[PDB]
Amino acid sequence: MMNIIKTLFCSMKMVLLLIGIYATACGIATFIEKYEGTLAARLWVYDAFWFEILHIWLVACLIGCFITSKAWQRKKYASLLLHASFIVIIIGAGITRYYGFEGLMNLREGQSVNFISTNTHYIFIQIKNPQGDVESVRIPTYIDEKVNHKINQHLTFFGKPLTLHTEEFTAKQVNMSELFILNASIDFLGKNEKTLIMRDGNNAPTKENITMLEIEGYKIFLAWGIDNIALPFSIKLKKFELERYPGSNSPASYTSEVEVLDGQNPPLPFRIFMNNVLDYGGYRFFQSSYHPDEKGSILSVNNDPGKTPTYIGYAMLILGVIWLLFDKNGRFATLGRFLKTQKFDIPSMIKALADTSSLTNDFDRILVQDFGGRIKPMHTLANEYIHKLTQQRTFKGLNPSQVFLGMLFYPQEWQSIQMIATKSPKLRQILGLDENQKHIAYIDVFTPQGQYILQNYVEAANLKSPSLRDTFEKDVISVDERINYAFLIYTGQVLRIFPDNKSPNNQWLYPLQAISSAVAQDDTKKAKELMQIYKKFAQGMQQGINTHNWQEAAQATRDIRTFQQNNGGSLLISPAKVDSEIWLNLYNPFYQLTYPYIFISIVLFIIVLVGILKNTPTRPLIHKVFYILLFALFILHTCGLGLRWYVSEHAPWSNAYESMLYIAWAAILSGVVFFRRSNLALCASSFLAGMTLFVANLGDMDPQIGNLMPVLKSYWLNIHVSVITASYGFLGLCFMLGLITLIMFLLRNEKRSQVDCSILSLSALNEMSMILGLFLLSVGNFLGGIWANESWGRYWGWDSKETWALISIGVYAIILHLRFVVPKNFPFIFASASVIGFFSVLMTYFGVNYYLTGMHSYAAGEAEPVPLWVELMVAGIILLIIIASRKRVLDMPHLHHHHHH
């Protein structure tokens, strides 16, 4: 049992400081990681001794604070377990930092390998004295192209003393890239020496660089290089194969087939996938890359003995989270019970082909193999291509299918109709057309005598830089991409449909290549059938332009459909998915949900604030009506997500557009289900959902349904992302409620009572929403680890999103705990804190996805320079807080319910 000695300063204030110092440290570390090499961020923060000092100090502070709080005399078992998870997790992390080592390994078909080469960099000294065969020492060094760090080292080896000092290093490009050449001074015994030492890249310490001297200490060796470590067993591989979606170079799967050789003289076989691993003898093997000649494999290995302590830690943390969320006592149930008491040739053919519904009804269902490897119904392909050519959804009364069919069959018209959109005056003037943009036409961009006017500009423009684009260059590259798309359509190379010939990898051919292959093949039968299809369909189109029956071309479309079902392989999707995809394209909810969300939120906020400004409660009818309406709209939303999941055949939260849709879903879930009792929570939640769907629909995000990267194919995709991105819903709800309670603070005029109880209830609602958000963020982060311990190769490596998730955990832990240290002001300080704290989450999402490098790039993009808009928004927030500060005095434990309380 602890006694209260002067050394026991342990009290919450010390935990808030420690968490603050830790958070600032990791932040500065992450920005150093960008302005200097990652080796400079391993230095100064992550591998620095004082960081381990902070870790042990934090553990001791957890023990001291729990002893001083009389946690064990009271029951509080849930808090004890939850909090003990941290003490374990930290122990496991320490064990891994001290005993666990990492390695990379290279293997070639038929090669046997029993040694692995470290990824860090070492300097090696060996001494031999005529007495004493060898002594050997290794020292780690943090120097490369971007950082220099003088080594100073004093050691005793043969038993005499030795010193080494190092100056700097130049990067001369003497063949091997830049053979690193470094200069050094030594003292051994009285002898003092000056020496030049050189290494190859991240490869073996070759003999040539190995440099040996024989003055004091007999004969001595010095080298600078990568270390090699020797396995007790041995490995051989006999395959590397990777499988790329049919019809595309996009790699779907990476595979190795591997045999394991040991005095268990029967070999043991295993096969390996990007998201699968091997465990043998205490070693774990993942698969990262492969030799560029596609017959060599690269593996990463982690002998991390701290695995099981950290996993038990994660299990304790999850059990504690569930326990505290269902505990009868504790903060969450107390706030729930509190809130329960409160009240709160043919140029006019457009119109001709507009009415072709009888044709398009079948045309929209012929499958096409997109260049991404996925098989699309032609409706989706037509939508994508036309919405890329013409920025408006409909070029004329023609829907996308009609205009696609028209520009396919009558290039002589549609290449001279103004449709290719442009948004730059300099581009239009350099083309010699009038200033009015007006969707320039395909024929206008090159001359019969000429080649292609923009060619000279794009070759100058594209390679320069994404980060300092110009209003001219942006539209130049964009219009070039659009013209390339149009050329693909006019050539017919996009209709990779008519055959499913089983010659290539599995790729479906386009019609002219189809005819060529059928002619190359003695399959004249197929050639003449395809010719009949072509002739019938073209004649039917001609008839439909000059008349109006269309049944001929519709029958030809039915013919190509039945040819699909006849010749196609296992790639053919069932008609159910085709129907689902066409429905999701026609009645896409995510474009329609955005505005009604915002407008309903605004009107409901106005109605509720009118009541709170007065001293009358809002009539139940209004709550019931808006609640049922929001619930119907939420059901429509979740059905939209369900259809995207079903048609994608993968979880619909994996490519940073879906992620925005799922954050919207989590935000609306928080308001509709959990906090349904309160009007202001529902208002804030629906407002958040609307705003984030609008941001997603700003057009920067790519919304089309693509196939998964191979790494993402793990089951953990369903649990890591879902919980992590659900956290942002509740945290954004906390942000919105913070702004709302600050406005309520402004309204307070000491004549009004309702305002006071309103703020007092909003504080608790914000607090419990923050509890839920934190818990989700913590659990999702750590489980994600359990997933990064299979995909990447280590469960924590201080990656740029890893560290910022931890920063967010730290900030919200500070905000939740500060209720223990700052009495009297509590509602206002908590409001301010819950408003400012959301900057950590906005950073962890946007900044880490765009403005910082890292491995978790599953949702990244090119960094546009930060808009001053956000700076003005932050200035507005800070001004609002300063103004609200004038009325902050309203203690938390007030008294008279109804009259107040």
Ligand X SMILES: CCCCCCCCCCCCCCCCCCCC(=O)O[C@H](COC(=O)CCCCCCCCCCCCCC)COP(=O)(O)OCCN
Q: For residue 493, what is the enclosing H or E element? A: none
Q: Which does 90 bind (CB under 5 to 8 A by kind): ligand HEB, ligand X, none?
A: ligand X
Out of 55, 396, 817, 888, name the contact with ligand X by CB under 6 A.
Answer: 55
First to last CA, the chain: 40
The annotation status of 794 as a binding-site residue, yes or no, is: no
Let me know: does 554 contact 362? Beta carbons within 8 Å: yes
**Token pair for residue 205?**
């310490």
- CB within 8 Å of 111: residues ≥ 6 apart: 236, 237
- By beta-carbon proximity to ligand X, the closer residue of 739 and 774 is 774
315 binds ligand X (CB under 6 A): no
User: For 877-885, which contacts have Cβ atoms below 8 Å and span 24 or more sequence positions?
Assistant: 877/835, 877/836, 880/739, 880/742, 881/742, 881/832, 881/835, 881/836, 883/746, 884/742, 884/745, 884/746, 884/828, 884/831, 884/832, 885/828
CB 892 → ligand HEB: shortest distance, Å? 17
According to DSSP, the residues that pair with 255 across neighbouring strands are: 241, 273
Out of 14, 21, 36, 52, name the contact with ligand X by CB under 6 A.
Answer: 52
Q: Which does 706 bind (CB under 5 to 8 A by kind): ligand HEB, ligand X, none?
A: none
- By beta-carbon proximity to ligand X, the closer residue of 23 and 661 is 23
How far apart (Å, rounded) are the C-alpha atoms in residues 747 and 724? Answer: 36
Stretch that binds ligand X, among 88-96, 129-137, 421-429, 738-746 (CB under 6 A): 88-96
How far apart (Å, rounded) are the C-alpha atoms in residues 279 and 282? Answer: 7
The annotation status of 650 as a binding-site residue, yes or no, is: no
Out of 8, 17, 28, 56, name the contact with ligand X by CB under 6 A.
Answer: 56
Phi, psi for residue 122 in degrees, rounded to 5: -130, 155
Cα dihedral 93, 97, 100, 106 in deg (nearest 10): 110
Give the footprint of ligand HEB on this chain (CB under 6 A). 15, 58, 61-62, 65, 69, 71, 76, 79, 83, 86, 324, 330-331, 653-654, 656, 659, 711-712, 714, 716-717, 720-721, 724-725, 771, 774, 778, 781, 784-785, 787-788, 791-792, 801-802, 805, 809, 813, 816-817, 844-845, 849, 856, 858-859
Helix, strand, or coil (residue 564): helix
Look up tokens 């509602």; give the residue: 827
Out of 31, 72, 77, 98, name the contact with ligand X by CB under 6 A.
Answer: 98
Residues in contact with ligand X, counted by CB under 6 A, come to a total of 25
The annotation status of 720 as a binding-site residue, yes or no, is: yes
According to DSSP, the residues that pair with 199 across neighbouring strands are: 180
780 binds ligand X (CB under 6 A): no
Pairing of strands 278-280, 268-273: unpaired
Nearest to 832 by CA among 734, 689, 732: 734
- By beta-carbon proximity to ligand X, the closer residue of 696 and 809 is 809
How far apart (Å, rounded) are the C-alpha atoms in residues 182 and 198? Answer: 6
100 binds ligand X (CB under 6 A): yes
Stretch that binds ligand X, among 90-98, 391-399, 405-413, 580-588 (CB under 6 A): 90-98
Question: Judging by beta carbons within 10 Å of its beta carbon (0-12, 13-18, 19+), is residue 428 exposed, middle or buried?
Answer: buried
Q: Which does 721 bind (CB under 5 to 8 A by kind): ligand X, ligand HEB, none?
A: ligand HEB
CB 54 → ligand X: shortest distance, Å? 9
How far apart (Å, rounded) are the C-alpha atoms in residues 802 and 848? Answer: 10
**Strand order of the sheet with strand 219-225?**
135-140, 122-128, 219-225, 211-213
How many C-beta atoms surround the C-beta of residue 717 within 10 A? Answer: 20
> What length does the chain have?
901
Look up tokens 């060599």; give the residue: 296
373 binds ligand X (CB under 6 A): no
95 binds ligand X (CB under 6 A): yes
The annotation status of 817 as a binding-site residue, yes or no, is: yes
CB 695 → ligand HEB: shortest distance, Å? 13
- By beta-carbon proximity to ligand HEB, the closer residue of 404 and 728 is 728
Show the site string, 786-805: x = touches ligand X by CB under 6 A, - = not.
----------xx--------
Look up tokens 């997603």; give the residue: 696
Out of 368, 556, 762, 809, name the contact with ligand X by CB under 6 A.
Answer: 809
Stretch that binds ligand X, among 93-101, 225-233, 252-260, 439-447 (CB under 6 A): 93-101
Q: Which does 788 bind (CB under 5 to 8 A by kind): ligand X, ligand HEB, none?
A: ligand HEB
Stretch that binds ligand X, among 49-57, 63-71, 459-467, 717-725 (CB under 6 A): 49-57
Stretch that binds ligand X, among 75-83, 627-635, 737-745, 806-814 (CB under 6 A): 806-814
813 binds ligand X (CB under 6 A): yes
Stretch that binds ligand X, among 76-84, 95-103, 320-328, 431-439 (CB under 6 A): 95-103
- CB within 8 Å of 878: residues ≥ 6 apart: none
806 binds ligand X (CB under 6 A): yes
- By beta-carbon proximity to ligand X, the closer residue of 51 and 457 is 51
How far apart (Å, rounded) are the C-alpha atoms in residues 330 and 332? Answer: 6
**Token pair for residue 379?**
């409706």
Helix, strand, or coil (residue 476): helix
280 binds ligand X (CB under 6 A): no
According to DSSP, the residues that pair with 72 across neighbouring strands are: none
Residue 176 has, within 13 A of its CA and on its CB side, a CA count of 14
Q: Which does 774 bind (CB under 5 to 8 A by kind): ligand X, ligand HEB, none?
A: ligand HEB
According to DSSP, the residues that pair with 138 across neighbouring strands are: 124
The annotation status of 713 as a binding-site residue, yes or no, is: no
How far apart (Å, rounded) are the C-alpha atoms in residues 640 and 658? Answer: 11
- By beta-carbon proximity to ligand HEB, the closer residue of 93 and 721 is 721
Q: Which does 353 bind (CB under 5 to 8 A by kind): ligand HEB, ligand X, none?
A: none
Cα torsion angle, 603, 605, 607, 609, sign: negative
How many C-beta atoms surround the C-beta of residue 573 within 10 A? Answer: 17
- By beta-carbon proximity to ligand HEB, the closer residue of 634 and 845 is 845
Nearest to 746 by CA among 877, 892, 887: 887
How far apart (Å, rounded) are the C-alpha atoms in residues 628 and 260? Answer: 62
CB 229 → ligand X: shortest distance, Å? 13
Out of 14, 21, 48, 91, name the contact with ligand X by CB under 6 A.
Answer: 91
CB 724 → ligand HEB: shortest distance, Å? 4
Show the site string, 5-44: x = touches ligand X by CB under 6 A, - = not.
--------------x--xx---------------------
How far apart (Å, rounded) are the C-alpha atoms in residues 174 and 165? Answer: 25
The annotation status of 76 as a binding-site residue, yes or no, is: yes
682 binds ligand X (CB under 6 A): no
- By beta-carbon proximity to ligand X, the closer residue of 62 and 533 is 62
CB 231 → ligand X: shortest distance, Å? 17
- By beta-carbon proximity to ligand HEB, the closer residue of 631 and 850 is 850
Q: For residue 825, what is the enclosing H or E element? A: none
Q: Which does 801 bind (CB under 5 to 8 A by kind): ligand HEB, ligand X, none?
A: ligand HEB
Stretch that binds ligand X, among 89-97, 537-545, 664-672, 674-682 (CB under 6 A): 89-97
Distances (CA, A) of 736 to 421, 725, 741, 845: 39, 17, 9, 18
Phi, psi for residue 651 in degrees, rounded to 5: -60, 135
- By beta-carbon proximity to ligand X, the closer residue of 744 and 783 is 783
The annotation status of 194 as a binding-site residue, yes or no, is: no
Task: Point out the annotated binding site for heme.
Answer: 69, 76, 83, 331, 720, 801, 817, 849, 856
Instruction: Return residues touching ligand X (CB under 6 A).
Output: 19, 22-23, 52, 55-56, 86, 89-91, 93-98, 100-102, 796-797, 806, 809-810, 813
Task: Point out the annotated binding site.
Answer: 69, 76, 83, 331, 720, 801, 817, 849, 856
